[model samples]
Target: VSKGEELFTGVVPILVELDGDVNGHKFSVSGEGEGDATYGKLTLKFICTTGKLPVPWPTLVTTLVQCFARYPDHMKQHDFFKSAMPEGYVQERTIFFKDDGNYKTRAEVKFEGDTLVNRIELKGIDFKEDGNILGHKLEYNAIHGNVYITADKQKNGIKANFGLNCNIEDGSVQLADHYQQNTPIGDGPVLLPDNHYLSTQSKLSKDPNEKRDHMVLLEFVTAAGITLGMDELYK
Candidate 1:
């Protein structure tokens, strides 16, 4: 018979961020979450009860306390995080946490629905194009790239807004330098790679009157490019 606590609800969890690689891009992400959770000690089952996600799901080894390791009947069907999603949701991940006999530490995550809001910032991104620098024909160094996108619950509705800065590579990245502040949050979503799946709003125009009849904006880093979306990122 199971002898552990039935469920622990309304938990503000502190998940320790571990190292991970996604879409050939390397990054580290960490955050705190407030949500409801349920687990079994004897059954070794861990789950997030509520449908809402407390924070963005980054692929890292999320660490928790081993405070729920009292039950002793071992059952290991799913190692880290396993779940039977409620509805309109997909199980993009299954990560397990270990027990050390002191703190109950395990991590499992689920994406809410088909909707996705992704923001990517790539630093020291160089470009290869024939465009005048500052309205003058000149050579330049590097620039910064930014992308924000979102899709609907059906994975069909899509919208995107992107920006690029020039004369950067240093002293930037904190959203400084020649960033485009006056671009319309276009009513469009960036095209996804051929994967049988597809999917924001704009900021403000710094100078509405300053018009560039013909100008080139930005070029994304296409080397071993990575696609990060709830539809595929979690898979």
Candidate 2:
């Protein structure tokens, strides 16, 4: 169970709540669920200084902009890639971003372990009508053999999933999460299980069924798995 926290630990939430004075809103935490050995659906909330702007009003735009540059990249680089993959898939690229907008840059990552980082803005595809994906990205750090990702759409964020090995195109810096697949289904990542940094229990493989993924939420009960250590680096 401790390992679960290490991987899907919701640290961003902890930072938002415990970090203090974010733009102006305060943080609040609440959860409910149980059975001696398990808990269902865990949720965390942080109230922004402004109300749910209804839509179109840009009141929260300030903080949004403040984080705009970093949100998406984070999703690609850490949030999305941070979790463990099924197994067999080796790490390829890692992408992440941070942003705020019906449209913005999302997160930005310049580093990953020893891997060099790169950032790019994807636009003009009309994420709204063409593909639910407002944005699609990939980050590859050969130094770490890890690849991050993102698919934040025209507005909110994209769903959570990995991609297959699309092509990285010759001479281009884009990492692919789209092999055996022509286009993705929704606004999300490439869903590459074998290519992520998952716990050993779930080290993904290229199996189309991805059966190993079953251990994801289940492995927490066991004592064998991988966990990253913080305070070790803050990049």
Candidate 3:
């Protein structure tokens, strides 16, 4: 049996900015998200204004597999691993909250059809390509990536979106800078490689000409079974 009280049941808004390197390529990513404990879902949408992503479908697949490989048990039990693995290879692989230093092995069971459990998804923004791969120009339309656990209930699964604009040259991705200058909320801030935070005061303007910042108004049901909006963060 599991202790229900031990599980956190609530919603949390997150804003993250990442500037680093992947396999030696410089990159920057920024985005915001919401974590719904009640639904066991986490969604994040980010954009990479710089750096190149590894290509060659096989390499991409392997890279992702290796990442999951770190979590051995979760990799074997989740259905996603079935699809994440190489064409013929079969195996298993597998954040958050404070670090207690101690590692606990959670249950390795799959969720029922509607049972809420851990779920996550990632999406790539501005699918358009601005760089070349192996001397060939690259372009994409509405490309997105997804990863999920027991709660395959598509409706409220965790999701993330990333925008990549770079070229693949010399057998590696040559990333290009393509940051967003303006957004629906207001003028988008120029992000640096260091810690940066956005103000919750930033919200949708009432003016008809001004676009709405939906991220601020997103609503989620808390663990106590109460609905709340991210806008409350400003208060």
TM-score per prediction, in order, is 0.19, 0.20, 0.25
lDDT of each: 0.23, 0.21, 0.25
State the local distance difference test value for candidate 3.
0.25
Candidate 3 residues lying further than 4 Å off, grouped into runs, are 1-7, 22-24, 49-235
> Which 10 consecutive positions of candidate 2 have the poorest summed lDDT?
60-69
Residues 57-158, model 1: lDDT tens digits: 210111212122121223221111111111111112122111100111112322233211111222211211222211222223333333232333244322
Sort all candidates by TM-score, best to worst: 3, 2, 1
Evaluation by TM-score, superior candidate among 1 and 3: 3
Q: Per-residue lDDT tens digits of candidate 3, residues 1-235?
A: 1222122235445444434332234444444555454343445444344534432221121111111111222122222222221111222221110111111111121222322222122222222232232223433221222222222233211121122322233444433321111101112221111111111111111234424211122222111111233665686
What's the number of clashes in each of the models? 16, 58, 21
Name the better of 1 and 3 by lDDT: 3
Ten residues in a row with the worst lDDT in model 1?
195-204
**Model 2 bad stretches (over 4 Å):** 1-13, 16-40, 51-80, 83-102, 108-235
lDDT for 190 in candidate 2 is: 32
Report the C-alpha lDDT of model 2 over 1-235, residue by residue, as the tens digit: 0121132322121111111122232222211111111211112122322333121111111111001011122223332222221110112122221122222222222223322122222111112321112222321111112212233334223222233221122333422221111122233333222122211111211234533211111111111112344655877
